[PDB]
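Complex record, two chains
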Amino acid sequence: VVPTMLQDWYNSQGFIGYQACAIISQHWLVDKACSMSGEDAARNGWELKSDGRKLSDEQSALIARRDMEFRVKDNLVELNRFKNVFGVRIALFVVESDDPDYYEKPFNPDGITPGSYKGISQIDPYWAMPQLTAGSTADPSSEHFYEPDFWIISGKKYHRSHLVVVRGPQPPDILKPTYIFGGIPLTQRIYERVYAAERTANEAPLLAMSKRTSTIHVDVEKAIANEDAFNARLAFWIANRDNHGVKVLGTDESMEQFDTNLADFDSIIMNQYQLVAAIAKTPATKLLGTSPKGFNATGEHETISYHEELESIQEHIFDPLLERHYLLLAKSEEIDVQLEIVWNPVDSTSSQQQAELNNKKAATDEIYINSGVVSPDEVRERLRDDPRSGYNRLTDDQAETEPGMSPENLAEFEKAGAQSAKAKGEAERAEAQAG
Amino acid sequence: VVPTMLQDWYNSQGFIGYQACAIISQHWLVDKACSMSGEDAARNGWELKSDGRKLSDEQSALIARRDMEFRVKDNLVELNRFKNVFGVRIALFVVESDDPDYYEKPFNPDGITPGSYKGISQIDPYWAMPQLTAGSTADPSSEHFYEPDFWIISGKKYHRSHLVVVRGPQPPDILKPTYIFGGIPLTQRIYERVYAAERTANEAPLLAMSKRTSTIHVDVEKAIANEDAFNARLAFWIANRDNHGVKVLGTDESMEQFDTNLADFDSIIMNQYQLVAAIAKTPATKLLGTSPKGFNATGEHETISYHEELESIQEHIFDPLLERHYLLLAKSEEIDVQLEIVWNPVDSTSSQQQAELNNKKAATDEIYINSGVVSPDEVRERLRDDPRSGYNRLTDDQAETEPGMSPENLAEFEKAGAQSAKAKGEAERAEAQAG
């Protein structure tokens, strides 16, 4: 069985509250930890793919205009940030309909009334109130068990399907209502470790101020009698204290001196900041600005652990938001073909590395074209629909489109075919003259 | 539940105030932290593309003249700097209209009266006053909840859409009014860490001044009788103190000496400066001039964490300003096509690295042209509209524009087709003679 001390040590990590989370979020370290996690994932942006190869130019211009008027980038960045701050975040796609009870029925893609998608809003948890139906609470076997069917925001109750909910680590069922059916907040995860790190960082300067504590053993009952000339003389000493002046003090007087050793505070401070980074799932290079004291220099393992793992998780968190946004944008406006989202690579590599990447990819393209695998048209389309490739602005023209020809093998094929015709004709002449 | 001590330790990080921010901003550390963040992002500048290939030269010259008269670079640099200093900055695009209530209606791109865009101004937060409407305060579900609809600057109330607002980390809703609906100021983030770092930097010289504290134990009740010849003798000793003369002092006198150990102050100082860099999200190489003591040498991870992440954040902060500026600079004047801004890469790499970059890109260009992917015209246009590429003055002529010919494959194609004509004619002659 679990011991009582370990049991109530673990049980005391309870939910702290939305007010406490908002109050603690003012601190720089928790703000940074909740901020530069999905912001880096959202940095490189996305690209539109659709069933067709290239979207129509007017369609792309309209999509860009609507995205800029809706502020999608800032929206999902704030979504991730406050989802990390609090336990959960709610994104409501505002859309206009004639029926006052529109946000009561389950969300239907047919209920459009075109030209009605006005934008999105993000509601903090204390402004909302999850509502459980009896069908969503009675049956553990139900796939919507302990999943809020409705959310009372301002009097009215928005249905679950209408809005998009992003939540934290999803605590177990028995204590899911204790988190108001949200998630475990990163503020609750790091309001203690951050405080310990900051206070240890505080203690070294403050103790260094009172490092040296030189004291003098004066006959105090003799200083009692005057105590004005005595204080004046010692104030003069303290004012003109120097490493060349000499202090005269009588017999039966010691004047000892003590000092503190502060060499071991740095290890404690950086050990706590490393744990801040550990809880934040973000490298200490990103949070602290560099690797902490004595730790091994950050490497390929940490770069793939951060740039690839956590950013892909944040991108799959963003994906419901972008998917519903593009549904309610495309289908609501006059379109013909549905839309889908491709995520740009998030490596943020330097210019030299980007050039090396482009050169190696060009070598692969040349090898494939020369071997006759892919036509240059595919390479043209890849360069056009590939940012950071050097050429995002080429033309509207078309390449050969024949499966891996290139001018070299085009000339070779024409010359070989004509020479083959010549040789077959000369062979037929040889048959005729030999016969 | 959060404890009382941790709770009121976190609650104490309140909003210091605009006066406090302005007063603290005089310090060098906070000024540098707020300065060299978006200034580096703005250094490399931008380029203009529009829907067309190249803007007409008269239009480009007019745009350059207007940008120089409006000092756009300096304004956006100051915008980022004081946005970091205070919690929020307001940029108002001044424009003239007949209606004295012009800055009351929501901003409309049609309300131009051409030749009226006179420039931009930046209003400090204490000169402004946000105003919230009942529609912007009653509904948490509203998209503009807790977003000031109007800003009283000088009596009159400018609408939100008319002006561009850049704000800090956007505190949560319950304490958003406590920041006057702005952002969390970087001065509030670093007025204590900066003080601790500077005071620790002060302590080591000041204490090193009073490092040695040699004292002499003379019978003071004997010195008291004369105390003038005694003072003169000791003053003579202190004046002619040297490591060769000898000091005579009678029996029952000790003359001990104390000294302080200061080898551990450097660790504290360079830990606190590293923490200041951590707050500023700026490398210690940029702030302190070099990596601090002991810490691993700054590398590729920190360069991609600063040059790519934070500077792109500053660029997307700048983007509303440039977008509105070009809206009211293009459409206000006589133009035909809208404008779009592209951002130069911000790496500031050395000349040798730039040459290697250009050489590798030229290798990619040669590979693609030889394989028949891209025509040399695209490479010419890229070089023309690519700064730091060596060629930015070339000529106004055109390349082949056929997709990937080059003179080599042009001559090869002509010769191959001609030899094909040869071989096919000889084949026809061979069949004619064989028949």
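Note: The two ends of chain B are 105 Å apart (CA to CA).
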